[PDB]
Amino acid sequence: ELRDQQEQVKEDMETKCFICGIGNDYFDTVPHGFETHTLQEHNLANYL
Amino acid sequence: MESHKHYTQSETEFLLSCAETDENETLDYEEFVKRFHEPAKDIGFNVAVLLTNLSEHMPNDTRLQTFLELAESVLNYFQPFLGRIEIMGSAKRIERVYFEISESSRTQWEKPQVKESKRQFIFDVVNEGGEKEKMELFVNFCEDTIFEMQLAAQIFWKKIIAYQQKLLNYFARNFYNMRMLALFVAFAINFILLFYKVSVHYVLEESSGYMEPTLRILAILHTIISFFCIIGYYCLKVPLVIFKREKEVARKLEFDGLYITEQPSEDDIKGQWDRLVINTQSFPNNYWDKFVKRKVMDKYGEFYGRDRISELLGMDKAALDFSDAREKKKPKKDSSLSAVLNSIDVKYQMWKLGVVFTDNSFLYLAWYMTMSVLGHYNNFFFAAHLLDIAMGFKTLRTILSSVTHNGKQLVLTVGLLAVVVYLYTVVAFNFFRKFYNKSEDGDTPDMKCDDMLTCYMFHMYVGVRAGGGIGDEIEDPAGDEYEIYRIIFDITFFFFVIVILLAIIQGLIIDAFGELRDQQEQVKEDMETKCFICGIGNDYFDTVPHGFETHTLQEHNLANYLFFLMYLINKDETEHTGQESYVWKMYQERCWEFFPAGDCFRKQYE
Amino acid sequence: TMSVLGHYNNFFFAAHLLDIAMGFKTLRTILSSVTHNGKQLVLTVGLLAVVVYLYTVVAFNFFRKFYNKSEDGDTPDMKCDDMLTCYMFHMYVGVRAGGGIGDEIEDPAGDEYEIYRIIFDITFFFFVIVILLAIIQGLIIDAFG
Ligand SMILES: [Ca+2]
Numbered sequence: 001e002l003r004d005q006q007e008q009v010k011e012d013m014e015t016k017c018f019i020c021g022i023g024n025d026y027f028d029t030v031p032h033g034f035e036t037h038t039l040q041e042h043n044l045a046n047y048l
Numbered sequence: 049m050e051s052h053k054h055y056t057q058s059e060t061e062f063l064l065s066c067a068e069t070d071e072n073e074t075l076d077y078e079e080f081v082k083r084f085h086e087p088a089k090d091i092g093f094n095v096a097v098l099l100t101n102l103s104e105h106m107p108n109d110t111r112l113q114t115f116l117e118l119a120e121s122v123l124n125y126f127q128p129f130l131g132r133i134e135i136m137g138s139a140k141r142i143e144r145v146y147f148e149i150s151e152s153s154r155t156q157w158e159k160p161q162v163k164e165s166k167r168q169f170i171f172d173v174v175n176e177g178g179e180k181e182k183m184e185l186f187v188n189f190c191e192d193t194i195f196e197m198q199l200a201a202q203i204f205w206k207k208i209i210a211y212q213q214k215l216l217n218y219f220a221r222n223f224y225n226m227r228m229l230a231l232f233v234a235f236a237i238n239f240i241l242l243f244y245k246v247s248v249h250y251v252l253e254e255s256s257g258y259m260e261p262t263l264r265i266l267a268i269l270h271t272i273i274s275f276f277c278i279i280g281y282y283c284l285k286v287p288l289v290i291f292k293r294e295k296e297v298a299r300k301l302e303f304d305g306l307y308i309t310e311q312p313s314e315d316d317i318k319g320q321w322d323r324l325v326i327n328t329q330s331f332p333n334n335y336w337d338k339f340v341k342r343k344v345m346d347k348y349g350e351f352y353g354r355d356r357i358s359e360l361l362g363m364d365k366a367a368l369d370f371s372d373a374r375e376k377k378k379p380k381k382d383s384s385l386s387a388v389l390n391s392i393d394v395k396y397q398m399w400k401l402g403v404v405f406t407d408n409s410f411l412y413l414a415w416y417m418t419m420s421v422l423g424h425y426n427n428f429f430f431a432a433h434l435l436d437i438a439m440g441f442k443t444l445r446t447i448l449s450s451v452t453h454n455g456k457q458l459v460l461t462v463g464l465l466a467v468v469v470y471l472y473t474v475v476a477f478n479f480f481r482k483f484y485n486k487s488e489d490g491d492t493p494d495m496k497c498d499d500m501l502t503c504y505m506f507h508m509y510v511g512v513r514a515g516g517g518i519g520d521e522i523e524d525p526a527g528d529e530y531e532i533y534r535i536i537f538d539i540t541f542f543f544f545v546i547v548i549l550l551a552i553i554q555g556l557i558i559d560a561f562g563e564l565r566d567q568q569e570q571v572k573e574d575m576e577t578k579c580f581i582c583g584i585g586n587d588y589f590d591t592v593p594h595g596f597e598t599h600t601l602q603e604h605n606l607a608n609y610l611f612f613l614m615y616l617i618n619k620d621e622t623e624h625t626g627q628e629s630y631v632w633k634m635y636q637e638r639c640w641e642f643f644p645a646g647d648c649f650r651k652q653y654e
Numbered sequence: 655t656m657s658v659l660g661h662y663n664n665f666f667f668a669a670h671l672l673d674i675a676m677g678f679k680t681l682r683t684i685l686s687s688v689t690h691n692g693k694q695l696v697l698t699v700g701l702l703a704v705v706v707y708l709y710t711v712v713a714f715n716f717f718r719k720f721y722n723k724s725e726d727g728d729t730p731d732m733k734c735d736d737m738l739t740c741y742m743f744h745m746y747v748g749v750r751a752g753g754g755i756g757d758e759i760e761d762p763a764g765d766e767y768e769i770y771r772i773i774f775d776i777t778f779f780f781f782v783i784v785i786l787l788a789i790i791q792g793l794i795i796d797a798f799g
């Protein structure tokens with residue numbers, strides 16, 4: 001259970017936005033869409 | 049022709065009107081079909097794709113219905129010859145393009161090695177690849193597979209070369225049966241080695257003749273079969289991997305500028321080994337693309353120095369060779385008269401060697417060869433050849449991949465086991481050192497605890513495998529001086545070391561095995577109940593009978609897409625249609641938006 | 655035919671007790687489970703046999719003086735002076751011993767081969783006992799589930 005919680009946290013950080021949490025498939029339309037959305041638009045470092 | 053029930057009398061007499069009557073009442077039908085069938089076939093294919101387009105666009109018209117019954121009467125011949133693709137581009141709508149598929153292409157697709165390449169691509173693109181680079185990997189697979197098909201179709205100086213080439217071709221064609229024959233001979237040799245005995249003096253005693261010399265015969269035969277397997281592999285599968293690497297490095301040079309502006313890192317040995325021959329003479333030897341050098345020169349010459357680019361990319365002092373070949377080029381040139389050998393480039397040969405010696409399969413074959421050679425010295429080394437079934441079968445490969453899967457976790461849990469065993473060893477060496485007397489009569493006590501290294505070895509060797517802790521094998525306390533502490537020591541040992549850490553390791557291997565099996569069956573289920581190209585799903589097509597099967601075998605066939613790419617490559621451009629030229633431009637600019645992402649013809653129209 | 659053969663030897667009527675296995679539902683489930691993962695079970699048993707044969711060959715080559723299954727003798731009952739005998743002894747004792755193979759043959763207690771013998775037994779108790787038997791057990795239990 002501890003291992004599964006760790007990997008689930010990792011999967012949620014990889015395939016879901018932290019701030020809005022709209023999902024991944026919505027941004028999986030243009031190339032590199034979700035990655036650019038998480039690195040430019042909704043960056044936690046940017047919010048800080 | 050009139051009794052075969054495929055011709056009426058009018059057709060029979062019309063075809064007899066085409067006779068030759070070579071003054072002896074005789075025609076040679078070879079000549080007949082050699083002259084009267086090919087253009088008929090071509091124009092029939094053209095009108096067939098026309099009628100197919102008209103049908104599959106405009107349905108349900110009685111006039112078009114009789115035209116369509118005639119169409120299908122023609123199409124019963126052109127069914128395995130026309131392929132259809134669903135492009136999405138240039139109109140924001142799904143377009144069904146039609147093209148021709150060659151019989152040679154169909155045969156090369158039926159060939160075995162392309163089938164194994166296809167199944168491997170499917171597996172490693174459904175397991176590792178997602179959807180961002182799925183079309184990238186699919187186009188790369190199509191290119192590698194058309195190169196595979198070209199190679200398979202390809203499969204004093206005019207007396208030895210023409211024969212040794214045929215020998216290499218036979219080896220490459222007979223590589224797999226050579227592997228099965230090798231496994232047979234290894235099984236036979238290991239059965240003979242099983243029928244064995246000992247006198248210090250090795251002897252095959254359990255037999256009465258007819259078995260001693262056959263061991264040596266089967267040994268030398270196994271060795272020659274290993275050599276033939278390796279030699280056939282080097283000419284069957286090494287071209288493919290070297291072409292893949294050449295394509296990768298050439299596209300990295302052209303697009304990204306890996307050795308022009310984006311010099312690779314220190315640990316990527318692949319980057320250094322490719323930099324080794326980014327400047328060789330025959331760099332794109334198998335990528336069939338012999339102008340990547342000039343392309344990258346024209347791309348990065350006006351910014352980083354044309355002289356420096358021509359120096360670091362090979363072909364030095366030849367910046368005007370293009371103009372020299374365009375204006376009054378040389379017609380041809382004889383090979384040589386004094387230089388019969390050493391014409392090949394030693395740098396490119398060394399690069400090919402360094403790339404094949406890291407293939408992870410040529411290495412396995414070389415291990416097989418050296419194990420056979422060592423078995424020639426000591427016949428018992430032929431037992432290592434029994435592990436060939438572990439790589440030949442699927443579930444045994446799964447077990448091996450499972451024992452390798454959770455590598456870091458397995459190493460770390462074994463380390464924690466060692467550390468806790470060392471803790472128990474130290475506490476037993478300090479306090480409970482008088483109980484480790486592994487003797488029954490002696491009278492010399494065999495104290496296994498009068499030494500730290502000996503006690504730790506004894507612990508990690510006996511207490512972990514005893515299945516019941518460590519105190520079921522060393523003497524019981526039976527004395528109220530340390531009994532409670534000794535009892536706690538053993539229950540703690542039998543807990544942490546036996547029923548916890550070993551259990552965790554066992555679970556690690558079994559869960560890795562189960563995860564690998566589940567990934568395999570999930571790949572199978574996704575290939576069975578989901579489309580590869582569009583991936584709309586199954587239930588959408590589960591409306592008409594055989595709907596999804598016909599959709600996957602006719603509309604969105606991966607073989608059809610590959611044949612369409614091959615047709616575009618061998619289409620002799622300036623003759624492309626609108627859709628064909630559009631798809632070719634997209635493929636040249638490396639965009640791949642012409643694949644139907646989340647739509648199809650049925651979802652677009654009625 | 656089992657009834658007819660029981661007419662000859664009355665103890666053949668014991669095969670008729672397996673009728674409950676077909677009459678009940680969960681016993682039919684257990685039988686269908688032992689038959690379900692057929693190919694996987696055969697292949698994992700084969701891998702077990704091959705790794706046991708590997709251990710048999712290495713023990714026959716190097717550690718052949720430890721397989722003395724006698725207490726007084728004085729005739730040594732060497733179970734390793736023969737490949738077929740050693741392989742049979744291995745696949746019969748080391749797989750069912752529940753603790754590897756060295757809990758039933760003599761301990762090294764000598765700095766001539768002790769470390770290699772120790773590695774041999776931990777590797778055996780790993781791959782043969784707590785891995786392959788466990789994989790087979792899991793195969794049947796997961797088929798049943
Ligand atoms: Ca044109």
Ligand SMILES: [Zn+2]
Pocket residue numbers: 017018019020021022037042
């Ligand atoms: Zn967001």
Ligand SMILES: [Zn+2]
Pocket residue numbers: 579580581582583584599604648
């Ligand atoms: Zn589809």
